[PDB]
Amino acid sequence: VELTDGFHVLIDALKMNDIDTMYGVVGIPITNLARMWQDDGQRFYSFRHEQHAGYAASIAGYIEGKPGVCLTVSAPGFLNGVTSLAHATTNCFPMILLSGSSEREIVDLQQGDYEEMDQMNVARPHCKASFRINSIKDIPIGIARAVRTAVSGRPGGVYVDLPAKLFGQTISVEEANKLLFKPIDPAPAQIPAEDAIARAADLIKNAKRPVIMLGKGAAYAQCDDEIRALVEETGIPFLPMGMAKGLLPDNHPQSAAATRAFALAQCDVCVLIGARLNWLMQHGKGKTWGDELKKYVQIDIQANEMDSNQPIAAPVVGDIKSAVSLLRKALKGAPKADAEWTGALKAKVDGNKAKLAGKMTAETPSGMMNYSNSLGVVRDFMLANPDISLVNEGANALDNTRMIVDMLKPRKRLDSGTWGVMGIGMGYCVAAAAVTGKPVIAVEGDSAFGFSGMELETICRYNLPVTVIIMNNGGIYKGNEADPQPGVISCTRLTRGRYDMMMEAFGGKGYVANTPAELKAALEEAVASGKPCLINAMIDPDAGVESGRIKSLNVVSKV
Amino acid sequence: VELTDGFHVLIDALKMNDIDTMYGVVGIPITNLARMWQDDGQRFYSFRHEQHAGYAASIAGYIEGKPGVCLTVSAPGFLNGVTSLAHATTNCFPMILLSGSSEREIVDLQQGDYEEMDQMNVARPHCKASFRINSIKDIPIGIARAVRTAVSGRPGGVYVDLPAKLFGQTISVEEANKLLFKPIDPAPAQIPAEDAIARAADLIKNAKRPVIMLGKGAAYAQCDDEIRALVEETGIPFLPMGMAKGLLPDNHPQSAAATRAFALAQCDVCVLIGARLNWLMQHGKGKTWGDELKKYVQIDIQANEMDSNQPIAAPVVGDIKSAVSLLRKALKGAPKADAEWTGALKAKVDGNKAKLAGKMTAETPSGMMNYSNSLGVVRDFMLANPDISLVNEGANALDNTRMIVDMLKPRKRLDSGTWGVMGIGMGYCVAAAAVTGKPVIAVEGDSAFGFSGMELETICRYNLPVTVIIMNNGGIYKGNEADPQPGVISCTRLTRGRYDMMMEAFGGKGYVANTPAELKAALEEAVASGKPCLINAMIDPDAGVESGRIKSLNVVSKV
Amino acid sequence: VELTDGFHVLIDALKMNDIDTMYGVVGIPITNLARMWQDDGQRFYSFRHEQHAGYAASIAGYIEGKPGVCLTVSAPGFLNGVTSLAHATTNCFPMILLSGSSEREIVDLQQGDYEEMDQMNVARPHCKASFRINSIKDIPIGIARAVRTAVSGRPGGVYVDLPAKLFGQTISVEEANKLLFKPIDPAPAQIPAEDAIARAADLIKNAKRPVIMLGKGAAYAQCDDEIRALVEETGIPFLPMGMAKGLLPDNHPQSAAATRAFALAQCDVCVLIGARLNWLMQHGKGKTWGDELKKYVQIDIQANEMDSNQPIAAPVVGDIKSAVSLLRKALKGAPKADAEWTGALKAKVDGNKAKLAGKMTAETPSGMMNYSNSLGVVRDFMLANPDISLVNEGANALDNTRMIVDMLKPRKRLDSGTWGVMGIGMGYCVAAAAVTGKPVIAVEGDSAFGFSGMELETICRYNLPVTVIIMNNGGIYKGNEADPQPGVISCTRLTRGRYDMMMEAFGGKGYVANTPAELKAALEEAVASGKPCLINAMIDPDAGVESGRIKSLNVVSKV
Ligand SMILES: CC(C)(COP(=O)(O)OP(=O)(O)OC[C@H]1O[C@@H](n2cnc3c(N)ncnc32)[C@H](O)[C@@H]1OP(=O)(O)O)[C@@H](O)C(=O)NCCC(=O)NCCSC(=O)C(=O)O
Ligand SMILES: CC(C)(COP(=O)(O)OP(=O)(O)OC[C@H]1O[C@@H](n2cnc3c(N)ncnc32)[C@H](O)[C@@H]1OP(=O)(O)O)[C@@H](O)C(=O)NCCC(=O)NCCSC(=O)C(=O)O
Ligand SMILES: CC(C)(COP(=O)(O)OP(=O)(O)OC[C@H]1O[C@@H](n2cnc3c(N)ncnc32)[C@H](O)[C@@H]1OP(=O)(O)O)[C@@H](O)C(=O)NCCC(=O)NCCSC(=O)C(=O)O
Ligand SMILES: Nc1ncnc2c1ncn2[C@@H]1O[C@H](COP(=O)(O)OP(=O)(O)O)[C@@H](O)[C@H]1O
């Protein structure tokens, strides 16, 4: 009788759940799983740190709508990955962290095993579910559970512990075929009641000044034409969140993005679609909402998200496709939004964009560019070349890029997310490149970049069409903070370094851009090349403000 | 009334407990703490990732015997630091992680605060104690509790949560000076009973083939002359664990390190001093210990470490200085270890060292150095220049350096430790440089290096006398693994990159060493320059073996 | 300005969410909440132990479909309640545990506060969400979050921490009335996709030997006519799990309950409605299911329950009323189940029931009733008086009562549940009595009874129409285990005690039933009296078997 082992059953189980790519860092006890995966013809991206393989997995999940798979070693490697699993779960990104672990006998008696840790229990706060597969016969079911938990309900992270003993277990090929199965409909549709839809439809119909807020949950849903059809048929102004940019084109005529404060302050009804009323929306209270409670319609898959911050007048619980699809029919033939309202917002949008256009054309000294004229170059490129992933993180580098760089296609803008994480950059580039097979542009704050910078080599090693733009202002927010004591560098200062040289250290192409013309020429050549590039964009050290747009959240001493 | 605030009471409380240095990364809500720390005249080291600021804090704790302090932001930054705290606790290194956290009310209802996380509860598995200081009046007590918990008993990590709202609370200066206090005897001696020492003394006096095993707990204790006096007076052969190297000079004539397998297998009594019978010692069982239970004598401050893995015949619970001092007096005038035992080991040491000398003189082609002739250069340099910290990590780069590079001085060798962590390299360098004010050499596997490599810029930014030697073999264990499929790079491969160029991108000095002679000149020049340097040492891709010495711990397929 | 406080906002918030009843035990810091709850005109039931107040809350949640509310003190009282919350979550019973907690500042520094515990963090494994309301202004949102979390998705427990300092905070009455709100649609319908229903419909239409398995999730859903209509229209044989008894009347002609082993072993398609393929169903494998994978159809609100144990061919995710309604319409006009299948089962049902009738008429000596003739009396009484709650727990007392005592009405049988808990008896009685306003019979193993027996006094104190039948066989499973040593009582033995006398000690009516005729008169008189009664039913000590039906799950020595 012919035998197979744990390595193969696991490989077969992943493939059966439509997984063909893993991001990770090898080592004991899983190096030979990584190799065999590759030998089978599947893809393995080796990183320089598991955190970044983890961030890659998380955004592969967002883009594709099937969980990104990260593979790590035990204890220290697991720890690094689980930080990324935590981020995924917070952002509602389907992801599976697979980690090897040590001997149950020794771990459970805390005797000091190789890389000892109860990884299953340590993972619990950072994921939807944390499982362990102890036996070969249970791998198919174990992977089904993981995939299902990651993509169903509110998508998120799942941890799957793989004890070292799992892989060397053997079983007959015959009984293995018997156990292998493909889960049926692991991310099922969830349809809301007629009366939940009728209530939301009544709120919208009777609204005087409605706004729609599109969150990245709406973008994740992959029902772009449904969402666009709803906006366009209702004639309701809309506002995208950071990663919902491009869901509808950011230059769509009903976009009130460029007059956001006035839109949220003055609206009466606000339709949240896959967007949480969390810190990014000021918890639905305070000055940004006119110091009043709006009438909210909220469409979310997670029932207990409703009323999490403010009372929701019309909670619609289900998957965005099903809910939006029904709401559209409910509103079919109803009057479009008030022209005095939509025309007021559009007038303030035109004025604000003209003010931005002026700033983007402004002339700065060589090597002392600002956030407007440098990112105006990226803006122009992304308007002509929209089928490109835009990775973005930083403070000023983030907030100015979100404002300035218009996205015309959905799920292209990949950014710091719900936790405002510095560190997602290079991992995000690898996964975007891997899953799209298309170019990536990253607009990186220089401090932001240093959290994942060593992964430039990973990008070079796989010769990915990634162009990393460093907003090199020489620090955190600013590059010019005075020495606090004599000979002592301020804590916010960073070396205004030759990041272009670092890229060329690993076979990449490096550029320095001292002006918008240099930045444009370099960007066009880098993207055209299809090769790994870095552009060291020299920004005025004094051009940024403290914490970007969220300056007011800083705690300052008044004594 | 003259008011002070939480920022300043915290600053003062830390200083009262002899803290003058923090390692971290700034941001909301803790940037102005960092600023004010520096304005006061204390050191803040800003890093590129909080994890490396944390590894830095952990080894500062080891070297100094006073808690290394790491400062982070909430959720994502906290998480990065807590991975290092975990490592500190596992290694018994005193360390305090201070992190800002968000609004109690919003985090507790999970409404989606800015960087929302119950950081206090997430730290719990990764430290000795996890605390939160909520009120200004409790800062001095909170800091006392953290310092005592980190340094007393078995030393380790402590998390201290600092809500955003702590810092802007106010109090009168004479109220604050009333609360401020310095703890008495935060790491007290703990003396063992006379019968504990007599039981140990009896076993040693009756041993036919005794060995002493020194662990890093023994090194941490800073009683080097006392431990050396015990070794010499007793005549007992000794072996250092990785970081206990140099506690006694590695070329001490009683060292059995060059004959470890034989010593441990054939001994009858084994005296453990601050060394756990964990995976590094194969749990005191199996062929490493001649397939039998030795008579173990164990000195440890942790009562319940006793009998963790094998029965301990002479458990001695107390601090190592106190214990060793009593054991010495209990053994006064006793005959020295059997001369035919000490003679047998010495001969095998001489034989094996001579055999290693043969390999270190071996000649290799340009750019294809092996681990013996490359590290033979570092060996000679460290013998001539012993007062230098030696950071080390990797597989072959770690195992070969521990064997070849002799330490003559205590607490200089700083390595991957209990969890065999890749990632500790550049933080360890910063901390060693900071707390010693003397040079640092790092011997880095190239894979290992990539876990903290971006921190080269941090080393350059503070102009530290650090020399990074990259053992550049182009991969994990080996740099020559065949492409598993046409055009697909193996998972164990890395770019054989110009790490020298990367160093020079941030103002550091970079070198390529293709031969031992080039390595020698470069290392001598690098250390003598007193500046940040990186030597890219070109190692034969086929020179290393899988996992170095712990290759049998791999799980391999057979089916 | 007219002020209100936390006590009153909390009272008002609970009432706004349709809460009129709490079960608990008073003390610091929550006695005056209890008092004021009552002063307002709402019910507070004081118990003798918080655990039983909690089991009471859990079954009130099951019966009503709105969260049962338990109130406790900090640490020790909280802990007792949280054991019941754990049970609620495990059984999918909506329940809120409110507990007072101590001072944030003292608990967080672990200084030793009055009843010190991070109760929020200790509850986490035992509920769906663990929250803390810190501020008066967040009470209405906090209570909304708890009610939604408990009732939505898969229903379950929620912990709500109430620091001592919450209650004495104040706010203006018109501010409080501005914050107070009632959540819209806290338990929404969730409708499955048409293809989910069509896949299920296809399998049922092609089944040769279909069965439907009803679980307590189906009973909880309160769509009894709809589920009965499905069973009748399809002609499919059905089986109820313990607490699904009476969903359809147990004497329904399509019931296969009296032929369970054969039905499950020989079926081809098995339709699971609110029933998990857990230990109670042997995980869908082994000889119980003919050693094969059936084609499972499963209706469950929890997406990731699918494929938890065996592959589900037709997963239908959504609320059971919505799902069953669609499945019925999808099966309209389909032929009824194979008559030779339904005929085979019916014959075996008739045979086995006739065989059970033989045992129930059996004659035993005075004071040595068996489980068949004693429970045969309860069977006849419940057939004649079906609108009564039947609480049940024990081993033989549980298994024999589930077999013998037919339920004609839904949500009346209330038993040990998913964890096979001993202890739920007297709390279940109090809650059933409270929420139904109708009589309650408890059939208690004597061991089982002792876990909550002191609550007899609580039943008497509220003069509830509860009749406790103690199946008094003098022990665990059996009352006759030999003394293992001279003068030493066996561990399985109990005093064959005068539980009647115990009842009468608190003003209850007590009976001894030594024969079925005495049991009948006593039960008839007890229930008709409308007063608290206990019937001490004398059972043959040798009548029961080890663990009842789950005796093969015992671990026994063979060496
Ligand atoms: C919280 C927010 C959602 C709040 O939104 P706002 O910033 O107010 O709005 P936007 O960014 O959409 O737009 C900014 C302003 O420019 C306007 N705007 C937008 N687009 C345009 C165009 N095309 N033309 C002209 N003007 C425009 C818009 O109306 C706003 O002005 P007004 O109309 O005047 O309002 C956002 O700031 C955000 O997503 N931030 C993420 C921050 C983060 O995570 N940072 C990393 C951590 S920093 C950190 O942790 C630390 O420092 O420490
Ligand atoms: C577990 C161990 C303590 C076991 O010790 P050993 O390796 O057996 O002993 P040592 O390293 O002390 O010495 C190695 C051998 O060289 C001999 N030796 C030592 N010094 C000398 C000199 N000066 N001259 C000649 N010979 C010498 C010694 O007697 C041993 O041979 P014999 O006496 O003949 O045996 C050690 O391997 C260790 O500390 N490993 C850490 C590994 C690690 O953490 N790696 C990173 C993760 S790797 C990973 O995670 C992954 O691969 O995945
Ligand atoms: C917190 C305490 C240590 C505080 O000590 P005190 O109560 O102040 O002191 P003592 O109890 O020792 O003594 C009480 C007083 O009587 C005096 N005293 C003591 N002994 C004597 C004799 N023999 N003769 C005369 N007087 C005496 C003593 O001086 C005190 O008065 P003065 O000189 O005038 O001070 C104690 O109360 C305690 O241990 N409490 C435990 C409470 C508890 O856990 N209860 C259950 C929870 S109730 C609960 O949770 C809830 O209600 O809810
Ligand atoms: N298919 C889906 N249907 C409905 N809601 C979804 C779906 N996928 C994700 N969501 C929801 O979308 C939300 C994402 O919100 P958030 O991450 O705050 O977006 P943003 O930051 O852009 O506002 C979550 O509340 C999540 O439950």
Ligand SMILES: Nc1ncnc2c1ncn2[C@@H]1O[C@H](COP(=O)(O)OP(=O)(O)O)[C@@H](O)[C@H]1O
């Ligand atoms: N001052 C001290 N006195 C006694 N024991 C100590 C002291 N400091 C640390 N220890 C103990 O020393 C041990 C360190 O062991 P370990 O980390 O396994 O060393 P190694 O890895 O070098 O063998 C721990 O068990 C710890 O409790």
Ligand SMILES: Nc1ncnc2c1ncn2[C@@H]1O[C@H](COP(=O)(O)OP(=O)(O)O)[C@@H](O)[C@H]1O
């Ligand atoms: N309203 C509802 N609609 C659909 N499924 C539900 C509903 N309420 C509870 N459930 C589900 O019903 C199941 C109850 O199963 P279980 O407790 O195993 O029942 P039993 O023990 O009777 O077999 C759970 O899986 C739960 O998710």
Ligand SMILES: Cc1ncc(Cc2csc(CCOP(=O)(O)OP(=O)(O)O)c2C)c(N)n1
């Ligand atoms: C994991 C983690 N650690 C720290 C932080 C705190 C932070 C927020 S923004 C930032 C860097 C901002 O400077 P950058 O150079 O990137 O952008 P710019 O304004 O253009 O100069 C840090 C360190 C966060 N959010 N996450």
Ligand SMILES: Cc1ncc(Cc2csc(CCOP(=O)(O)OP(=O)(O)O)c2C)c(N)n1
């Ligand atoms: C956080 C973490 N993730 C992975 C690993 C697993 C590992 C152990 S050793 C190693 C690299 C070995 O290659 P290196 O180049 O450094 O040395 P050399 O043999 O001379 O070529 C890895 C990735 C560990 N230990 N910790």
Ligand SMILES: Cc1ncc(Cc2csc(CCOP(=O)(O)OP(=O)(O)O)c2C)c(N)n1
């Ligand atoms: C909280 C808890 N602790 C222990 C147990 C274990 C147990 C299962 S059944 C049982 C008692 C069986 O005797 P009983 O008198 O009730 O019934 P009978 O067979 O007719 O004599 C116990 C103690 C469980 N399930 N829960």
Ligand SMILES: [Mg+2]
């Ligand atoms: Mg910057």
Ligand SMILES: [Mg+2]
């Ligand atoms: Mg290498």
Ligand SMILES: [Mg+2]
């Ligand atoms: Mg009994």
